[PDB]
């Protein structure tokens, strides 16, 4: 039952704990409760980290059939 969000603004990680996200990226949301107010933890294409929560848009959980 994984949550997903779509990146609306890009963000380049500035330390080890951040996640670099590009516009259009579909990020797996891991945790909304992080040490920093306004930041979420996510996973993307093998990496993981925190990003600002208003750089992204929550998606409906609907997914087309896969192979």
Residue numbers in the entry: -2 to -1, 270 to 328, 1 to 6
Task: Quote the study on this structure.
Several lines of evidence support a role of CMS/CIN85 (Cas ligand with Multiple SH3 domains/Cbl-Interacting protein of 85 kDa) in the regulation of Cbl-directed RTK down regulation. CMS, also known as CD2AP (CD2 associated protein), shares overall domain organization with CIN85, containing three SH3 (Src-Homology) domains, a proline-rich region and a coiled-coiled domain, and high sequence identity and hence, it has been assumed to belong to the same family of ubiquitously expressed adaptor molecules and elicit similar biological functions. Recently, SH3 domains were identified as a new class of UBDs. In the current work, we have performed structural and mutational analysis of the three SH3 domains of CD2AP and the third SH3 domain of CIN85.
In light of these results, and due to the higher CIN85 SH3-C affinity to C-terminal GST-tagged ubiquitin reported before, a NMR detected titration was carried out with unlabelled CIN85 SH3-C and 15N-labelled C-terminal His-tagged ubiquitin. Interestingly, our NMR titrations suggest significantly tighter binding as well as different areas affected in ubiquitin upon binding compared to those previously reported by Forman-Kay and co-workers using non-tagged ubiquitin. Furthermore, the ubiquitin areas targeted in this work are very similar to the CD2AP SH3-C titration. According to these results and the high sequence identity (53.3%) between the two SH3-C domains, we produced the CIN85 F322Y SH3-C mutant and titrated increasing amounts of it into 15N labelled ubiquitin. Although it was stated that this mutant abolishes ubiquitin binding due to the replacement of the key Phe322 residue as in Sla1 SH3-3, we observed binding with a similar affinity to that observed for the wild type form, indicating that CIN85 SH3-C displays a comparable behaviour to CD2AP SH3-C towards ubiquitin binding. Bigger differences are observed within the n-Src loop. This loop in CD2AP and CIN85 SH3-C is one residue longer, resulting in a different position of the sidechains and creating a shallow and highly negatively charged groove with the RT loop, accommodating the ubiquitin C-terminus on its surface. Furthermore, the F322Y mutation in the CIN85 SH3-C domain does not diminish ubiquitin binding, and taking also into account the higher affinity of CIN85 SH3-C towards C-terminal tagged ubiquitin molecules, we can conclude that CIN85 and CD2AP SH3-C domains present a similar ubiquitin binding mode. These results are in contrast to the relative orientation of the CIN85 SH3-C domain and ubiquitin in the previously determined complex; the difference might be the result of a distortion due to the G76C mutation and the incorporation of a MTSL molecule into the ubiquitin C-terminus, as well as due to PRE constraints sensitive to minor alternate conformations.
